[model samples]
Target chain A: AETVSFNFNSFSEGNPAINFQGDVTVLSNGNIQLTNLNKVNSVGRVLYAMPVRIWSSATGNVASFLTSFSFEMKDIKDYDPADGIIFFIAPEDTQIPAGSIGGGTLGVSDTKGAGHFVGVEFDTYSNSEYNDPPTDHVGIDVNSVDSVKTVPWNSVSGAVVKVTVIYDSSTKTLSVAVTNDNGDITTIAQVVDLKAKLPERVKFGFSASGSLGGRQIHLIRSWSFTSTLITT
Target chain B: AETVSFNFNSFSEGNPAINFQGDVTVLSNGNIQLTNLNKVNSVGRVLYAMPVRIWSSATGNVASFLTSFSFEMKDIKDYDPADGIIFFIAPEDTQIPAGSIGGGTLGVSDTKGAGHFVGVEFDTYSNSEYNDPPTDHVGIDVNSVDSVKTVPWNSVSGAVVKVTVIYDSSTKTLSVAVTNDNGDITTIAQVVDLKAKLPERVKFGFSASGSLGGRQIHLIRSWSFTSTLITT
Candidate 1:
């Protein structure tokens, strides 16, 4: 039973939205921005993951366990894109895409992390799939190529959303889900596991990209994890 | 005690797509094709109240009601005027919509007989007031002008969908839900009350219309009512 909290009370610390609730920390390398561009890549970025330490009861070893965080976003530019805000979890490996332009370092770009990544994307821009306008919803992306399933972009602004990602080593399965400010379950992406794919521990964070027309702003509400990690 | 059976194990007097599990019947002018051009003008036209009977005692009055239906529809000719479907209940009154393009007769246009009509509609075409494609959903139509609200069209139909409507007078509400053949609850229309607008002695049936690009086609798998008949 290991717990860690990085309270990100503001975006100036690198959080995405202007405001949010819960314990979140702003990484100097991560921050968020807003734009009114009606294009594919129109958004600022917010990225930060708690660097936790767990313990292994097996060998009486003190290690780290990645747990939870919740943040809020505000004054986000509005647009309907094949893309929107994104959620990602991967190994805190060095190959993490920091501030890439087009792809926005969305787990889909670089496969350096534990390829077992899940994204609850508020897709506003086109990604070789349904390029139709008025696209905004939710979706999940794997290694490099998208799994070929996605939701449309958000047509409204200040649409705060919540998402949850859980990893179960027993079944080696990753379960993901999203909810809107109104507590409506938007997307449920239940499939993916690192223990099964790359069998490794990883870091987690959120990312946003796009401009004017396809603009998107994101905030994390709350994140929690219950795992078999008695120690590490 | 009141109990209604399909009489026939399987029956489709004319249409093969329609099969009965218990007792069923088909009257000459009973089946009405209520499309954009057709309607339930008075009562008899595009309406058929199956078994045409309700319970007499409180004990046998309410039973578990169930029904299902499906059909193939052509594309909506024009999108400006969206498509719509309706479930209705009314006292016996002939002169429904004149066949071949009745606008709202199938229980929508007439207010007199349309009174005491509790209907769940899948509305598409905008009616001046609250007309937005995103606002499509099921509603309970009282007197005539969708007294309550409505469900959207796309939320109900798949390539071909089997729609089901259930009325629980005990709760004094109507529950309308849709499911595909493969057994998936495609959409669940909002619920409402029947006694709120219509009397218990009225007849119950279904109606539908299409837009320019839509071809009106409706399929019902099963239908049943478990309420005591109100008679002096």
Candidate 2:
């Protein structure tokens, strides 16, 4: 049996044994500052857990898993907050490619193949590159900027948003629940086989990016993850 | 029983889910370079595993522990290097102190009391604040930069240094051995109880620093750690 659990109150006082690249930092307020509001062409990423083998090369794969995080995005500039952020699982590559420009790519993908992964994107901007709808929304993506499912999102800036993503191995169902500080909840679910989409071992992390038009501060207040796979 | 192990090849390609801060980077040759030879005022750190609880508050305490790593340092410039590095166990504070300037501090301690921990220093500079002898040496520390014991260290640049630190719960003995690339080895030992010196849970990592006057590149080739403990 294999199980792993992680919780982070603040990256300031301390942080988990994780990997961070690009412009990420522990803000003075103890939150993880993924991107600064004024910076353009910024990319920040943090790989949360170790190399986790969700499936075996021979048989058996993907036990039930639960991951949740509380984060707040503040639009410091008023021009539509250029890009967005993502919670992703990629094929064990900690470094994001340099060409993964912000905007619709959300810092994880590029026109020329950077990330081989799946993700949940909280997209705030519209761009032709991603075929995004003209409003802020939440999306589920597999290997590309185009989402498999998307839902409209509306919430005040600086509001605490709690998100929970659960994967049920038995049913091959992935569910997402987002709740705002006002107690409004949005739920979405999909049936997908991670064992079929991803490799036997994968790296999990967060990535955010933005353009020069407008920017926001992507901050993580807290995070937690539990999984059945023993990782290193 | 609890045991954790991690190995790093290159941060550029990918890294284990490990925490890193400051000027660390991965070289093309696959070494985790802590600092560059040209840059000064550099500080880097990596904490392995997660927050490891050495002892449970209720019933159990620490057991036998062993940690080892292989590393190298290169003096790119002919000038004498101004600082060194340390392997440390601290109380989960990731931030280094403001007063921990490069040179004698070794990037782990300062008079302002930023961290509460213990460490083994690979001291390359002779500074008066810690009463270091006038030669490169290894020292053991508790809660302060002043070490309790010291042994002379003489090795050439580009030499692979293999270090192994073992803690025996049966005898409460902590021993360290260093083997140079030429097969020269030095050993040192001390008696201490971590249950009395630290909290039930602690963090383990490596930290390094350098001054502007003289700088070198500290690199880690490989690392591994294991311990037996009852955890929450």
Candidate 3:
């Protein structure tokens, strides 16, 4: 199987076949901005336009992967932010469901299609419906919006943070860690079955939404992804 | 100019040129779902894949459009949802930005490309960043995540809601109204220069995101759209 790799340290580096949607924009500074104070109830997102092979459908051999990115969430006007950010893998041709603004849909999808993917969540708000453990936390999820596991996180608005996610085929485990400036760290992990949860080939990217009166500017300053799968 | 029209009482009727992204998907029930209890930090959205001509760049004559849709948001996890929903117009090929999970990014592009579109929000949460004035409200937005205007709303979880949006070329006004079961209604409007904010040809769609634990399942049941412009 083939691998997918990219390093977008700055958005201005070059034009990739990125499918941009909603309130998301690449700023003049070459940073990816997810939401804005001016974009009420809007969504901002981007995806690698192409699909990547995560596993071999024939042999069911899953690919091991590693990814990392730098991100920041800053409050534009809220003393408390409404939602947060997500890094996920999904079906090819995935998109933001229409009418998904200001929602708890986590910027990936509404209920109908959300059953087909996996994600890592960095939450800044505590809404009891989805079982947010606290005002700030980090977790991992599968088809359901509920967390498989979580860890409390102190989200300092406007502070840039680094996140790394890895999947191990041998262990069938998905792990993620978030590191903030000054060396603060928070992590979460869960057992996941890739061949059972998602298609062999998948698309991946970042998504964010601007909740009403809750504009935490979601920014992805740098990103790098590499994956490999072998067919027996 | 040509007119675009369609009525989708159920999504199963026939396949149109729709661009499905993120976690958005059409179910066997013929419904469009944006988020789910099973999909944490996922996004659900769909856009009319093709671009519509909102204005004639040559003559600068803008078009008038009328669109209506039915939706329902049901509680899956939280007593209070994190964010809500959006109906919007954007760059012909817009999509959800990557890394936008559990965010205020609202199911659209993260900050990078959010400046190039307009949206109408049906918010279920009270976030202060994007200027949500109430826990439930409706508003209009331009290139920014901030709203130009808003009005209070009472969101009844699981109740089917009806929404209609219209743009008048003569007045340069964009108006939207939401009506709930049992006859409760709320409306919002704004004067926008589509010629300036968007390209002559643009795409339109709906988007929603699931916040950390605020899983309010977003469902779009029925939809209809029509537009016309007379060239001088």
Q: For each model in turn, which proportion of the native inter-chain contacts is also found?
A: 0.00, 0.19, 0.00
The digit string of per-residue lDDT tens for model 3 on B90-202 reads 98778676677544567674644245678887877765666668557777878755667778887787889999889998899998878879896677788998878888778
Q: Per-residue lDDT of A1-232 in model 3, one digit per residue for the tens?
A: 3344555666631233356766777676778887655766767667665466677656678889999999998875443475788788888767676576554557775644254558887878765777778668887767755777888887887798999988898888998888987897887888998888897667787876656756677888887777766555
User: What is candidate 1's lDDT per residue for B158-231, written digit by digit as tens?
Assistant: 35555544443333333444433333232332334443443334455655543333344443333433332323
Q: What is the C-alpha lDDT of each candidate?
A: 0.40, 0.73, 0.73
Give model 3's DockQ, 2 decimals.
0.01
lDDT per residue (tens digit) for residues A1-232 in model 2 = 3454556666532223566877888775667877756667788878764576676544465656899988788777465675777888888764666655666677788854235778888888777666888888888888887888988886458888999999888887889999977898888787878998897668778888778776778887777777774222
Total clashes for model 2: 1
TM score of chain A per candidate: 0.59, 0.91, 0.92
Which candidate, 2 or 3, would have the higher DockQ against the true structure?
A: 2
- Tens-digit lDDT string for candidate 2 (B49-73): 4666665555556657788898788
Cα shift from native, residue B145, model 1 (Å): 51
Q: Could you give the candidate ranking by TM-score, starting with the highest?
A: 2, 3, 1
Candidate 2 segments exceeding 4 Å error: A13-16, A112-114, A229-232, B1-232
Best-matching candidate per TM-score: 2
lDDT of 1 at A80: 41
Model 1: CAPRI class: incorrect
Off by over 4 Å in 1: A1-82, A94-118, A129-134, A148-155, A211-213, A219-228, B1-232
- When summed lDDT is taken over every stretch of 10 residues in candidate 3 chain A, the lowest stretch is A10-19
Looking at model 1, residue B175 earns an lDDT score of: 40
